[PDB]
């Protein structure tokens, strides 16, 4: 099998710990963590210019993953799309490593 989660996947990081980690980084650095306020969701924490913002990973009954309109077969394909299409609709923010 594959076992190992992707490098940016940190199941047990709280929203606050994700903020503290990402405030040290540039725009677009990000992590994926299991959700706190909704057990059973995942969240994506992303450095913006002045703070860290959070996105809810959406799903449908076919198992697709999405944030907005475009849908993906996997979390990895979602993350990949947001490297070159802005994950923010108010400012331009691209996921980066």
């Amino acid at each position: 099998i594959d076992i190992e989660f992707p490098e940016w996947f940190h199941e047990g990081l709280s929203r606050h710990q994700a903020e503290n980690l990402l405030m040290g980084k540039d725009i677009g650095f990000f992590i994926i963590r299991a959700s706190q306020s909704s057990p059973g969701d995942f969240s994506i924490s992303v450095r913006h210019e002045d703070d860290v913002q959070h996105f809810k990973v959406m799903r449908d009954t076919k198992g697709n993953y999405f944030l907005w309109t475009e849908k993906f077969p996997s979390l990895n394909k979602l993350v990949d799309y947001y490297r070159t299409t802005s994950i923010s609709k108010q400012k331009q923010v691209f996921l980066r490593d």
Binding site: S37, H54, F55, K56, M58
Partner: peptide, 6 residues
Amino acid sequence: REYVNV
């Protein structure tokens, strides 16, 4: 809690 896309 708030999320951008919710």
